Amino acid sequence: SGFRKMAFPSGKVEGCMVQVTCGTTTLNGLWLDDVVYCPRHVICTSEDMLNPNYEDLLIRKSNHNFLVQAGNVQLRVIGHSMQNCVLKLKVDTANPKTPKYKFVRIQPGQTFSVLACYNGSPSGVYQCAMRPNFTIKGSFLNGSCGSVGFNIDYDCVSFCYMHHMELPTGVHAGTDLEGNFYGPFVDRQTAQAAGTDTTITVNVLAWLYAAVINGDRWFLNRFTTTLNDFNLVAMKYNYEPLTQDHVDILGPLSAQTGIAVLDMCASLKELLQNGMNGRTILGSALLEDEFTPFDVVRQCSGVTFQ
Amino acid sequence: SGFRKMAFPSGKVEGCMVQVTCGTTTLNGLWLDDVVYCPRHVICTSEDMLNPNYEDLLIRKSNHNFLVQAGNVQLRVIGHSMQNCVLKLKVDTANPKTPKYKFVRIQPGQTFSVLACYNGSPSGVYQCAMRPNFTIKGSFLNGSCGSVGFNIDYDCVSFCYMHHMELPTGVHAGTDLEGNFYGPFVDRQTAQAAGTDTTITVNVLAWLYAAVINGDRWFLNRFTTTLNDFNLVAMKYNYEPLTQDHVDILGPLSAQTGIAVLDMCASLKELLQNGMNGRTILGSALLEDEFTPFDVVRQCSGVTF
Ligand SMILES: O=c1cc(-c2ccccc2)oc2cc(O)c(O)c(O)c12
Ligand SMILES: O=c1cc(-c2ccccc2)oc2cc(O)c(O)c(O)c12
């Protein structure tokens, strides 16, 4: 019983966090095998934040301009290369603590854990969601760039996020591990703003199922709804439109609780209309949307508190 | 910028979790030096659960009844022992990944990270606070017993909790690592109910400072309050009494933000007897009380381990 915003155990990522310095700029790097990945704006100086030509900045660098530090050991760079907005430093030494891993790109609504790091050393870990506007609501101070987001499935670390910048509204944008940004963002200090954010509908429904699994159903009602009539209502509360694919993904959870997806959609419609009237759901007075259907099945029991 | 429920990195504890099997029952153990710590109720059977005699139950078993598994390697038990409600299994191997550590007993209102485990394998990590009624609101299924809660200070893990049981309302009860129970519960299948809980006042104010530090200031006001006057208000809403020492502990947060403590107390007062008036604070519709003052200073200055 209980339900928590639960990150993955971060030990396998802790062993890969290094420190990258170029001139007077220091950030975090990801050491896997004999390569260190870090954001390419590590090569920018104070007069390079607005309109940097990274190709022109990189060609002015030798291998010995990049100081890489793994704890106390100094890894010697023997090669460097740029791929989109991530820099790849070939080092002397394969990281002995390298886990099994893969680089993946995720879609909005999907979740991942963040190991917030500073100077190559970890500060904390927490759960995150790629918002529909391709930002994340993380906890990032200056120097955290290079901190990675990840999921762990059967001792394989699927790396999905690398932090690059802080937006003027306080949310955060970054790339996948091949250097391609999430959203229309770029590694320039010029004025950027994210699109209008939106609530992750399929996640709210999965969360409602998790509340039923844990033994609460005061919010259900006797109604059902059509998918289109639900989407017409939900979008007036700034919810993402719910697709048939999402409906199919809530299949397992609909089968565990015996509540049909469009029946849970009907309950959500009433919750948006009424609020909670001084009640809570899984210890929250808002509608949580940063648990995916796979997250809920992972953390929740296989038997409902019926 | 941004503020999140941030757990400690779990890698140091990850290398200490093993599987403990006694006959039918399988739970988790903590492998440190050459000892394995785990709840003593791993010794009970379905029959014993109602009025067990742990001393007699334990006398009747030897070292080979205890199956300890560290991943793929099996650790031999060379001795078994009981210290309060935890079982100590002496093993043939000192854990090589044993970190610098100590056993610490915490206070209600204090926070820690929980490494939820199943069959000796870590599955997740999250922040807890110990409730003033000595329960914690964790996320545990069956098989999670033996999972530990910990804090970190510059390379030193401080173990403060071991999970033992779920109470009927779904909250959880456990012990420190010396086997002493937090709160008035026993490792017996019987009728046990958590006391009436209350809200950790000093933690709510620390979280309001965190909201100010993050440039979210709409709840402040121009009033004052004495300590007493605020305490008379807080007790109606079932808030823990805020002592002088709590006001002292909020000093550094007061200094950084420019908001005097009792001015923030005045701001919490109006927030209680009137509500949020539709707005939120740090993306939350509730007044969060699971951040200590130290948590707020650690997250907003980025202390590392
Ligand atoms: O938002 C950031 C933007 C840039 C940046 C640097 C050069 C050119 C363009 C953008 O560098 C950063 C470095 C950090 O360590 C950090 O925490 C950050 O949030 C940023
Ligand atoms: O609540 C629990 C109670 C008991 C227990 C122990 C001895 C006598 C009677 C009951 O064992 C457990 C074992 C677990 O693995 C677990 O997750 C649990 O929640 C419990």
Swiss-Prot record, chain A:
<feature type="domain" description="Peptidase C30">
    <location>
        <begin position="1"/>
        <end position="306"/>
    </location>
</feature>
<comment type="function">
    <text>Cleaves the C-terminus of replicase polyprotein at 11 sites. Recognizes substrates containing the core sequence [ILMVF]-Q-|-[SGACN]. Cleaves and inactivates human TRMT1, preventing tRNA guanine(26)-dimethylation of tRNAs. May cleave human NLRP1 in lung epithelial cells, thereby activating the NLRP1 inflammasome pathway. May cleave human GSDMD, triggering alternative GSDME-mediated epithelial cell death upon activation of the NLRP1 inflammasome, which may enhance the release interleukins 1B, 6, 16 and 18. Also able to bind an ADP-ribose-1''-phosphate (ADRP).</text>
</comment>
<feature type="cross-link" description="Glycyl lysine isopeptide (Lys-Gly) (interchain with G-Cter in ubiquitin)">
    <location>
        <position position="90"/>
    </location>
</feature>
<feature type="topological domain" description="Cytoplasmic">
    <location>
        <begin position="1"/>
        <end position="306"/>
    </location>
</feature>
<feature type="cross-link" description="Glycyl lysine isopeptide (Lys-Gly) (interchain with G-Cter in ubiquitin)">
    <location>
        <position position="5"/>
    </location>
</feature>
<protein>
    <recommendedName>
        <fullName>3C-like proteinase nsp5</fullName>
    </recommendedName>
</protein>
<feature type="active site" description="Nucleophile; for 3CL-PRO activity">
    <location>
        <position position="145"/>
    </location>
</feature>
<feature type="active site" description="For 3CL-PRO activity">
    <location>
        <position position="41"/>
    </location>
</feature>
<comment type="subunit">
    <text>3CL-PRO exists as monomer and homodimer. Only the homodimer shows catalytic activity. Interacts with host FBXO22; this interaction promotes the proteasomal degradation of nsp5.</text>
</comment>
